[PDB]
Structures are given as C-alpha cells and as structure tokens.
Design a binder for this molecule. Structure first.
Ligand code: FAD
Ligand code: NAD
Length: 963
C-alpha cells in the first residue's frame, strides 16, 4: 500500500484540459540547420542575451563527431568545459558516453571511476562561478542508466561538490525509471541531511525507442521501453505525480515535453500543492514559440534546448538532430484522460528482468545489475585432465565406443535438448574457464556459450528433419572425431559433438591442447544431460603416435576439424580416402565506399578486426576503402588507440591477450612492414611473456603483397586504397580464402553488385562480419577456407553430411519439366533424376530463405552455383545424370584422368564401378580438394549439393532504427 497514490490529477483533470486548450490558442533539415550554432561564434552569445532578456534560460548541448575514441571524447569534454567558462551560459548538458568512449558495459565500477576522474574539472568550473551554473547528465540508451545514476550520486556527495545543484535525466518510457526516481528522491533526502544542495531531475519521455527495439530483437530480449505510447504517457504522469510534493522539496523537476497536456498537468499539480519553486519546463529552442511564451507566463522558468557544435562537425550534427526530431485536438484530450487513469497501474519492473521465448538462446544482459553482480564473482576452474600417449589406449577406447548400439532419433533429440538446458546452467562455470584458460573477455566468451547451446537445439531439430518423407534414405556414420581449436573452445568442440550425435554417430572430442580445461568443464554438462561414456568420449591425445593413431584410425568415419589448412592436409595424408569436414581460417575484408556511414563503418571495422585480439577465422584483417571516405580513417585510428588491452579475466579489458606469444607469421604481422606501407597505429608488446599486444593498423597494403594473402590471426588490420568498387571486389576475392566479407554502403546499386560479385561464404552488409549466430548466419567458407563438400555449420545440411545417402523406391509426383532436361533424360533412372532435381529446386535450392525473420536484419540462406566440377570414371548414364544437374546450375563438367592436375579446392565427382585411382586422392589431400565417391543419386535433394555452394547474406535493414 503506497502513500504516494492520491486523486489530485483526477480532480484537476478538467482544469488541466482547459489549461492545455488555452495555451494552444495563442524540408525539415532547413529548420534544424538554422538552429545549430557555433560553440565559439557570436550568434550563440547574441541568443543567450536575447533569450535571457525575454525571460528564458538556454540548455547548451555540444553535438559533433561520433564518440568512438578517447580523442573525440576529450573533445566533447574540454569544449563543454570551455562553454561553462562563458559567463552568459547558465546550463550545459552532456552524456557519459561523450565523456568516455567505448563505455564497457561489464565494468560499471571502472567506468564510474573513469567518469568521475574526467568530469571533476568540469564540475569545479561550475563551483568557480556564483551563482553556480548547472550541469545536466543526459541519458540516451538503457546501458547508460545505472552507471549515470551512480556517477551522479557518488560525485555529488564528495566534500568538494556537496553544495552544487546539478541534474540528471530520467526517461519515462522506461518502466524501471519509476524505481530510479524513488531511489533518487531518497538520495536527495540523504544529501540534504548531510548539508548538501538539491538535485534536479529532467523528466523526458525518451528519444531512443527505435534503437532500443533493434537492440532487443537482435539479442532476444524485451525492449527496455514500454510496448505502447499510452504506457509512456501514463508513467510520465506517475513520475510527475510522485515527485511534485513538499515531501520531495530537495528534488527540483524539469518537465521536458511539448505535449501541452503533460505540461499543464505539472503546472496545475505545482499550483495545487504549492511546489511552484520546484517546477521548470524544458522545451526545444525555436520549435513552438507562441506556446512556450504562454507557458513561461504560467510556470516562470522555461529552459530551451540549444544545440551547439564545433565548425567542422556541423553537417554531422544536423543529421543526428534530424533523426531525433523526426522519430519523436479532442482525441488528444481523450488519450490524456486515459493516461490519468492508468498512471498507477503501469508496470514498474524492468522489462529486461526476463526474456521472451526465442529459438536462439539469449545472451547475458549487462544492463541488469544482477548480471554485473555475478560477472564480478567469476571463478577460475581447474579440472583435472589426463594425457593419452599409448596407441593401445586409443584402440581400446575407439572399439569401446563402436560397441554401444545406435540410439533412435527420439532419444538423441531428448539428450541434445537436455544438453542445451545443462549448458545454460553452467554458463557461469563456462565463462570462468573461458576467461582464464582461453583468455577471452566476457563480451567474447558469453555469445559463444549461446552458440554452444544453439548448436544442441538446432541440430536436434535437424535430426528430426532427416526422416522427412522423400526419395532418399540416410544412414549415419558410426564414429566421428572432432578435433577442435583454442579460439572458440566451447562452441566449436561442442558443435561437432552435437552434430555427430544428431546424425546418429558416436563422437570423440579431441580438444586443442591450449584449452583442455574448457573441454572438461563443458563435458560435465553433457554428462549431467545423460550423454555418457558410451556416447561421447573426451580424448586428450598428444600430437605424436596416439594423436596420429586417432586421426588415421580405420574405424573413424569422419573428422570434423577446425584449424590450419596444413593440418587438414596432414591428417588426410595419413588416410587419403577419409571423410573430413574442415573449417580452416580466412583472410577477410570489409569494403567501405564513399556512400557509407563512416561512423557505423568504423565501429564495425574495428570491432571485427580486434574482437578476441583478431584471433578469429572470420576476423576483419583488411578494410578496402574506395576513393575518399572522409572522417573514416581519423575515427578508426581514434577508436583503435582507445581499446583497453589486458587479460580476458579483467572486466575492464576490451581487447584481450593472445593464447600464446606470436609465431613467425603473427610476429611478422605485428613488427615488420612491407614496402610502401606505414603504421597508422603500431602494435606494442605490453608484457614480458609476449601475450599482450596493442593493436596495429597498416596503411597502403597492396594487392598481392604479403599481408594481403596471409592470415596472421592477431590484432593487425591493413588498409587498402582502391580506385573503384569493381577493383575493391577484385581485391577482396584474391586473398586465396573465401570465409567472411562485408561491404559498408548506403547506395543500393553498390550493394546489389557486391551481393552478386563477392566470393565469400558469409557476406554481411552494413554490419560486422563476425558473430555468426546459429541458423541466422550459418557459418562456412569457400576456397582455402573449407575442406570437404562443405555444408555450413549451423545450417540445415550439416548434420546430413555425417553419413551416407541412398536412393529408395518412391513415387514421383507430377511436376512439369522444361524440355531441355527431358532431351537428356532417356532412362528410367535419368527421368527420375530429372524430376527430383526440379522438385528439389522448387523446394530448397532455387529459394533465398530467411529462416529467422527478424525485422531489423535480413538473414538469407541461399545456394550459389559451383563453377566447375571434375568427373572421374567412365559411365555414360551417370555422366548424363551429371549433365542434367549441370544444365540446371550452370556448372562446367571437366573429365579428369589419373595424373591430370586440378586446382586447389576442387570438387571431383566419381562415376562408374571402378575405384578412384589412388593418386587422385593423394593429390586432393595435398591441395584440399574433395573426391565425392559415393553412388550417383537420382534424388537431386542430395546430389545437387555437389553442384552448389551454400551462402549466408546478412543485411542491416534499418537506418538508425527506421525500417
Ligand atoms: C528540452 C528537452 C530535453 C530532452 N532531453 C532528452 C534526453 O536527455 N534523453 C532522451 O531520451 N530524450 C530527451 N528529450 C526528448 C523526449 O524524450 C521526447 O522524445 C520528446 O520531447 C517528444 O515527446 P513529447 O512529450 O513531446 O510528445 P509526445 O508525442 O507526447 O511524446 C512522444 C514520446 O512518446 C514515446 N512513444 C511514442 N510512441 C511510442 C510507442 N509505440 N511505444 C513506446 N513509447 C512511445 C516516445 O518516448 C516519444 O518520444 C528531450 C526533449 C526536450 C524538449
Ligand atoms: C589458424 O590455426 C592456426 C594453428 O593453431 P592450432 O595449432 O591450434 O591448430 P591446428 O590446425 O594445428 O590443430 C587443431 C586441432 O587438431 C589437433 N592436431 C593438430 N595436429 C595433430 C596431430 N599430429 N595429431 C593429433 N592431433 C593434432 C590440435 O591439437 C587441435 O585439436 C593459427 O595460428 C591460425 O593461423
């Protein structure tokens, strides 16, 4: 039972509506352009004099270049400090994210200390004048909420500042801002009791709804603001109601609204309750002058928002302002009546306290304080593990796994779903081991735990899709070996294990030696889930006889490998006929054309280059700029110098250390330049061991130079300067790799050309090229980035590789065929393959498929034609079956003999009854090609995969939220 509830608003309702009607009684870029003023020009001082004379005070707010680095952050602060030295200026307002760039959401304690350390000179400037001018802390995003309130309350209780009247914004569209108001109102009572001065809250409804909904939909969270504007109008009245009392004399209030009903309410409440000296009204300078003057005569104090800017930042600042001003009379009086009634009934908990039902597992939310609380208490688990060195133990363990009988699809599905539940329960144990043993930050390790959970649920669904009624039958492998790397030490090992189980096989997990405790901690979830030693076996083999015995073992049906392409050739050399599916790094670029948003491009380039210190198969190693990209390079430099280098287990780290000191390749990338190149930012070695390296940026990296064609797997980004988009696309395509790639451009024709011409498995448009989410962006590369037939992990065809398919007897439905195909189909078998190709093409291969259907991001799964297929053997009928497939995809068939050469990463189809000659297998193992040696299937749903390259195209759909 809450003593703040009352009926004053109900009683004043009609004098309020009369008041609003009374005040209302007495293209766009042109307007905002004439309202932004030079922070140093005379125009501003004239407007301060003229408005002071008319009885107004001005809220001076400094706009400018996006605050991506400490350089520009110092600019906003020092330049705001200069305005507070101007005696005509009464009121400045600034945001935490303008004072600290790249505000790390996981380090609230450190962010607070940094903000206080940086803002004290500014508040001192307000103490050196009497009367003291006013500093307001603005709020835009939900992540600003607790750090800013904490900044406000700690700073204003320091002895130095105890008597300074200062202010802070609450956004009423956040339900939990009602709780923030109550805590701030108590804080003001605690402060007054200590002899301190009042605080002031500026009440706003909220200007960031668009990006707040995007932030939610991307992560699988509820939006932080209310779902409807009625709730916002209601909470605006509730917060006003609560705070405009004599009980809270120490909290002055700025009502910031052009809604005359909202303002008339605060006016009438202040008069009825005798708290007129706590009510200022804050409005937009120049927007509604006739209204604001009516308001002034009633309320007294009216404070006009006045945007100012540094000269160069003018056109930049006008665009920021255009979005804010765009996105934000009897049916007006009725919507107000309703908000008066809902005032006390609207929610007050934070929408982020729980999560909507989504398919993808949702990440940890550092906007919740309960999240930041367990992030402080993470542990350093040290599970025991054993090294396998005896080949006879590999043999004993392998045969023991084969003896367990196959589980049926229901049992596998139940185990996988349980495995995903249990992984979630140890998310914090996984974070503990990943941030110590693997050296990852929380921001990098936490989505990886989500990926590991998603693999279990996704591949569970896929396993059911194997028995879908159709024209072929799947038979799983008995045993798959998963050889995993260290950079993603939970999701990649588990993803291969889950895929094997879903297919019907037993799995051996052999984890990379740097991250053996990661595998052990993850294994405890599988065990809790019911996945015992008869199903999955963890084998820490060496890389000598026992490891080789495991990878070459006659009873291992496939290896899933993530690592160096030299490792894939090594393994296959030991058994060239082996099934191997390998993801093997990439040399990935982001193209930035003059039509790009330079700031969004910089944020995506630097985050893609430097997450996990660049230790990603998908990392952005190259940025290729077309022509002149303006502020891009300066901002990229500022953002890169601002990354905090340190160990992953330190909350303040925003770029972690390396897994071990650089090898030859990476040390070269860090220390030495090639001809004509220069360091825009030169990497520095920051500790004796050589694991902590600051990031670097090479300029003038030329096509075919060493850094263009060698993945260093470290914190090094190279800039190439291209004369045209067409040339930049040539350069992006000639790295030897084809894993990830992105373009930044707001020009639709450039994007369409890029979507068609770029040769990468994972394409991204106007966003980062890392962070692939299961089913949203199925992950896998072309060219040297992949070994095998190559279905994408986290895509619908991956499980189906872990076995073999055969044609079955079935009745084909009636579907029409174009006559060119029927000319080729001169057999029972060939007619059956012609028809099934048509159906598969209609069902799957000819469709661009967005499985997740997000509003803010288009995520497309499509098939691209394989250009050339090599054919080994002689069999006219089967060769005609391949001509049918090639006529439909456009692929070129090339007949291939023994000892005839073929390029690296080729696909070679085996036809006929003869074995494939061994030399072809041996050569394929050296240059990473794949000999497809199963029977030729009539069912194109299976056979056509040999003629297609899977591809994910992910495109941002919104322009700062608008879609
Ligand atoms: C002087 C001044 C200072 C300001 N300072 C800030 C600041 O520091 N931080 C900040 O975030 N904004 C700030 N604002 C903007 C404020 O938050 C509003 O966006 C704006 O003033 C318009 O709202 P309203 O009360 O005029 O009119 P209205 O038409 O009454 O209110 C519009 C508001 O309703 C809300 N809304 C509309 N549709 C929906 C929906 N479908 N679901 C949920 N909510 C919805 C939005 O918050 C929207 O802004 C400031 C505004 C002024 C005038
Ligand atoms: C890429 O990947 C590079 C190499 O990193 P990496 O050494 O961890 O990957 P890697 O390609 O050498 O090996 C990855 C996995 O295969 C295993 N493996 C490699 N050789 C083996 C052998 N002879 N016997 C048994 N198992 C073996 C590894 O231990 C690990 O589990 C990075 O530097 C980057 O350039």
């Amino acid at each position: 039972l809450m003593s703040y509830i009352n009926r004053d608003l109900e009683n004043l309702q009609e004098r309020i509506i009369a008041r609003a009607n009374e005040w209302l009684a007495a293209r766009l870029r042109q307007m905002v352009s004439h309202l932004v003023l030079d922070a140093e020009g005379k125009a501003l001082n004239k407007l301060l004099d003229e408005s002071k004379a008319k009885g107004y005070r001005l809220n001076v707010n400094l706009l400018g270049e996006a605050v991506l680095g400490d350089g520009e952050a110092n600019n906003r602060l020092t330049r705001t400090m200069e305005l507070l030295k101007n005696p005509r200026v009464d009121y400045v307002s600034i945001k935490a994210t303008s004072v600290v760039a790249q505000l790390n959401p996981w380090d609230i304690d450190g962010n607070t200390e940094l903000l206080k350390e940086r803002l004290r000179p500014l508040y001192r400037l307000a103490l050196q004048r009497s009367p003291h001018p006013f500093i307001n802390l603005d709020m835009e995003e939900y992540k600003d909420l607790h750090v800013t309130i904490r900044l406000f309350e700690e700073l204003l209780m320091e002895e130095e500042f105890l008597g300074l009247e200062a202010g802070i914004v609450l956004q009423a569209y956040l339900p939990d801002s009602f709780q923030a108001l109550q805590q701030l109102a108590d804080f003001a009572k605690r402060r007054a009791a200590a002899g301190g001065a009042k605080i002031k809250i500026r009440l706003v409804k909220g200007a960031n709804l668009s990006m707040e909904k995007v932030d939610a939909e991307l992560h699988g969270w509820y939006p932080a603001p209310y779902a409807t504007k009625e709730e916002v109008d209601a909470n605006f009245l509730r917060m006003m109601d609560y705070i405009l009392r004599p009980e809270h004399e120490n909290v002055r209030v700025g009502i910031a609204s052009h809604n005359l009903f909202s303002v008339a309410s605060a006016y009438e409440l202040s008069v009825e309750r005798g708290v007129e000296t706590q009510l200022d009204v804050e409005m937009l300078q120049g927007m509604a002058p006739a209204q604001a003057e009516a308001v002034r005569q009633a309320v007294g104090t009216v404070i006009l928002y006045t945007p100012v800017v540094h000269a160069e930042d003018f056109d930049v600042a006008v665009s920021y302002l255009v979005r804010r001003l765009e996105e934000n009379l009897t049916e007006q009086e009725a919507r107000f009546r309703e908000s008066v009634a809902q005032r006390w009934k609207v929610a007050e908990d934070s929408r982020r306290l729980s999560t909507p039902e989504t398919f993808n597992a949702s990440d940890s939310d550092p906007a919740l304080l309960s999240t930041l609380e367990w992030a402080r208490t993470l542990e350093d688990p040290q599970p025991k593990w054993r090294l396998i060195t005896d080949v006879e133990e590999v043999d004993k363990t392998v045969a023991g796994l084969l003896k367990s009988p196959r589980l049926d699809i229901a049992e596998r599905t139940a185990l996988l779903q349980r495995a995903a539940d249990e992984l979630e329960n140890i998310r914090q144990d996984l974070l503990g081991v990943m941030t110590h043993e693997a050296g990852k930050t929380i921001a990098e390790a936490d989505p990886e735990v989500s990926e590991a959970i998603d693999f279990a649920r996704y591949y569970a669904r896929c396993a059911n899709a194997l028995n879908t009624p159709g024209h072929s039958k799947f038979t799983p492998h008995n045993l798959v070996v998963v050889a995993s790397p260290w950079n993603f030490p939970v999701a990649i090992p588990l993803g291969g294990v889950f895929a094997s189980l879903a297919a019907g096989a037993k799995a051996i997990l052999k984890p990379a030696p740097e991250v053996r405790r990661c595998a052990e901690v993850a294994l405890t979830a599988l065990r809790k889930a019911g996945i015992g030693e008869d199903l999955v076996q963890l084998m820490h083999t060496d890389e000598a006889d026992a490891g080789r015995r495991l990878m070459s073992h006659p009873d291992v049906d496939a290896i899933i490998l993530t690592g160096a392409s030299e490792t894939a050739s090594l393994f296959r050399g030991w058994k060239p006929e082996m099934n191997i599916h390998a993801e093997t790094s990439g040399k990935n670029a982001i193209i930035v054309t003059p039509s790009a948003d330079p700031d969004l491009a910089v944020a995506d380039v630097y985050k893609s280059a430097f997450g996990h210190a660049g230790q990603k198969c998908s990392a952005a190693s190259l940025v290729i700029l077309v022509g002149d990209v303006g502020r891009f390079t300066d901002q990229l430099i500022d953002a890169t110098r601002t990354l905090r280098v340190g160990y992953g287990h330190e909350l303040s780290t925003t770029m972690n250390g390396l897994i071990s000191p650089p090898g030859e390749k990476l040390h070269r990338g860090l220390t030495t330049l090639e001809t004509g190149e220069s360091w825009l930012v030169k990497p520095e070695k920051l500790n004796d061991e050589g694991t902590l390296w600051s990031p670097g940026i090479r300029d003038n990296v030329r096509p075919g130079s060493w850094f263009h064609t060698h993945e260093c797997f470290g914190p090094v980004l190279g800039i190439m300067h291209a004369e045209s988009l067409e040339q930049a696309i040539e350069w992006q395509n000639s790295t030897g790799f084809g894993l990830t790639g992105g373009i930044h451009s707001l020009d639709e024709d450039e994007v369409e050309l890029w979507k068609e011409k770029v040769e990468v498995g994972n394409a991204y448009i106007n966003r980062g090229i890392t962070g692939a989410i299961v089913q949203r962006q199925p992950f896998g590369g072309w060219k040297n980035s992949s070994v095998g037939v190559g279905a994408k992990a986290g895509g619908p065809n991956y499980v189906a590789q872990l076995g073999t398919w055969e044609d079955i007897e079935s009745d084909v439905p009636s579907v029409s065929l174009p006559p060119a195909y029927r000319e080729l189909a001169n057999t029972e078998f060939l007619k059956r393959a012609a028809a099934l190709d048509e159906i598969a093409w209609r069902t799957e291969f000819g469709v661009e498929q967005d499985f997740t259907g997000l509003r803010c991001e288009s995520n497309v799964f499509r098939y691209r034609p394989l250009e050339t297929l090599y054919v080994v053997g002689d069999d006219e009928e089967q060769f005609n079956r391949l001509k049918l497939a090639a006529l439909r995809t456009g692929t070129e068939l090339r007949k291939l003999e023994t000892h005839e050469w073929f390029p690296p990463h080729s696909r070679i189809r085996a036809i006929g009854d003869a074995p494939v000659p061994t030399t072809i297998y041996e050569w394929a193992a050296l240059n990473g090609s794949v000999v497809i040696d199963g029977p030729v299937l009539a069912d194109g749903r299976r056979e056509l995969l040999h003629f297609l390259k899977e591809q994910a195209v992910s495109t941002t759909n919104h322009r700062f939220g608008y879609i």
